């Protein structure tokens, strides 16, 4: 029925405490944002 | 001597807010972490 709700911080997962790495991640656009919203989805419809 | 290393940034942060037309008051939530900074 329910799956273990997992939220993954692609900002720190990809770039842990790095500013230049964070800028490089931002250069890719919003991919981190799509990942975050997809996981928040998984969580919300799992709760539903 | 043997020392342990633990990465920082425990958990995340969430925002609890009512409707924009209701009020400006907010409540913050720190996931899977005890109240340390406050």
UniProtKB/Swiss-Prot annotation, chain A:
Function: Precursor of the fusion protein processed in the biosynthesis of the S protein and the formation of virus particle. Mediates fusion of the virion and cellular membranes by functioning as a class I viral fusion protein. Contains two viral fusion peptides that are unmasked after cleavage. The S2/S2' cleavage occurs during virus entry at the cell membrane by host TMPRSS2 or during endocytosis by host CSTL.
Source species: Severe acute respiratory syndrome coronavirus 2
Full protein name: Spike protein S2
Source organism, top-level taxon: Viruses
Gene name of this polypeptide: S
Stated consequence of mutating residue 36 to K: In strain: Omicron/BA.1, Omicron/BA.2, Omicron/BA.2.12.1, Omicron/BA.2.75, Omicron/BA.4, Omicron/BA.5, Omicron/BQ.1.1, Omicron/XBB.1.5, Omicron/EG.5.1
Disulphide bridges, residue numbers: 10-32, 15-21
Residues of the full protein shown: 729 to 776 of 1273
UniProtKB/Swiss-Prot annotation, chain B:
Sites where a glycan is attached: 21, 34
Domain of life of the source: Viruses
Quaternary data: Binds to host ACE2. RBD also interacts with the N-linked glycan on 'Asn-90' of ACE2. Cleavage of S generates a polybasic C-terminal sequence on S1 that binds to host Neuropilin-1 (NRP1) and Neuropilin-2 (NRP2) receptors. Interacts with host integrin alpha-5/beta-1 (ITGA5:ITGB1) and with ACE2 in complex with integrin alpha-5/beta-1 (ITGA5:ITGB1). May interact via cytoplasmic c-terminus with M protein. May interact (via N-terminus) with host bilirubin and biliverdin, thereby preventing antibody binding to the SARS-CoV-2 spike NTD via an allosteric mechanism.
Function: Attaches the virion to the cell membrane by interacting with host receptor, initiating the infection. The major receptor is host ACE2. When S2/S2' has been cleaved, binding to the receptor triggers direct fusion at the cell membrane. When S2/S2' has not been cleaved, binding to the receptor results in internalization of the virus by endocytosis using host TFRC and GRM2 and leading to fusion of the virion membrane with the host endosomal membrane. Alternatively, may use NRP1/NRP2 and integrin as entry receptors.
Protein name (record): Spike protein S1
């Amino acid at each position: 029925v329910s799956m273990t709700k997992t939220s993954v911080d692609c900002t720190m997962y990809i770039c842990g405490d790095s500013t230049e790495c964070s800028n490089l991640l931002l250069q890719y656009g919003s991919f981190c944002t799509q990942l975050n919203r997809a996981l928040t989805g998984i969580a919300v419809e799992q709760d539903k | 001597e043997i020392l342990d290393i633990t990465p920082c940034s425990f958990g995340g942060v969430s925002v609890i807010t009512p409707g924009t037309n209701t009020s400006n008051q907010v409540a913050v939530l720190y996931q899977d972490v005890n109240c340390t900074e406050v």
